[PDB]
Amino acid sequence: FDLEGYGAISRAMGGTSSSYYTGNAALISNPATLSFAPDGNQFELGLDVVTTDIKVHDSHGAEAKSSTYAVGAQLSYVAQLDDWRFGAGLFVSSGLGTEYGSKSFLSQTENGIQTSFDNSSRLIVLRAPIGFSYQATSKLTFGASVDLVWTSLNLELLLPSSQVGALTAQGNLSGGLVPSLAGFVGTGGAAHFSLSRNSTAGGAVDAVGWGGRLGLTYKLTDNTVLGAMYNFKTSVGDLEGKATLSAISGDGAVLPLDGDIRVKNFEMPASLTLGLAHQFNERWVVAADIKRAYWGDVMDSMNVAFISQLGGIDVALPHRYQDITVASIGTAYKYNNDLTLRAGYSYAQQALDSELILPVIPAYLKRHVTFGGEYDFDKDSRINLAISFGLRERVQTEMLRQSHSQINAVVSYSKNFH
């Protein structure tokens, strides 16, 4: 979602972030970094663009071709008040997700009828940090940040009867409606969710949250820095909106019901990263961070409740223990006095599998490989660059094979106010 450091610049160097100037994006990173910022007041201005490519194939020529793009932004201004550095920003990750069309084997009944229903998802995060960085000694900086959050989810899932069957079997599905139209669907049917309503005026199924953050740094040597930060599991609230469940019979008939979803305990990971920035040269600077996503850490259940005039349906997915580890290294050579060149590789590696291959919910990529530079044309104006690579992956276990990749591409601009 954003466990990739973030920063037009912190993206260029493998996602590294913990101990070196990473731009104003250190507000959602390590706010202690903001103390390595030029004097006066930096004003960052970022524009993100991701595209994503998913191929799903199984039981012969299953042909699910998704290929969306998303687009984010960055409006930030970190201001220096002596040893204090105050700052705030707006950050966007809008359009992220999937779209398969209503032509897919994903849009065929469990018995195999081509439905007109769509398979697609799209999320919109809206972080808004208020942060500070505090210079303390000639060797140690500290920073915190707190952010209001706002998420918006539209999605068009379809579940071939047997999946629903498995969900009732597990004890995860329930509700008035399950008995009632079990026979209308019938083994060989399918139910289909559609929370659309992107008109936020409607319901949209959206929520407000609160993230947190704080970190530090140590100049162990004069040519070596020592970063650490703990992102808090962001307390997202309930996603309440308006959706439309639609059961589908063996021969292709459709009952459209209209109600309200309430998604509960969408667990976001707390994370703790550590690393360093050795500088054995006045061009060659190199960063290396390890990150540990404190993932599954509460013993709740994500609870999706659909309530209609005709009764409720309800799904409860437990919070399995889980966690990931992103080893990220990055590099920035100074070709000249106006030019830095960055590159980075990073390898995430999660444990305990959790291989619930959800086509409409893409999975985090392990190997990333990123490049990028910087260029000055004003010295009080400045402009950063990055591109990263989601490296080819296979994941598969109903039987389903999926193979997908991602490709981020950022820009930002800092007009400095001395």
Author numbering: 4 to 400, 408 to 428
Q: What do the paper's sentences say?
A:
Thus far, only the FadL OM channel family has been shown to mediate transport of hydrophobics. PpF1 has three FadL orthologs, of which TodX (Pput_2883) and CymD (Pput_2901) are located in the adjacent tod and cym/cmt operons respectively. Here we show, by using an integrated approach combining growth assays, X-ray crystallography and molecular dynamics (MD) simulations, that MAH uptake as the first step in biodegradation does occur via lateral diffusion. In the presence of TodX/CymD, robust growth is observed, providing the first direct evidence for MAH transport by FadL-type channels.
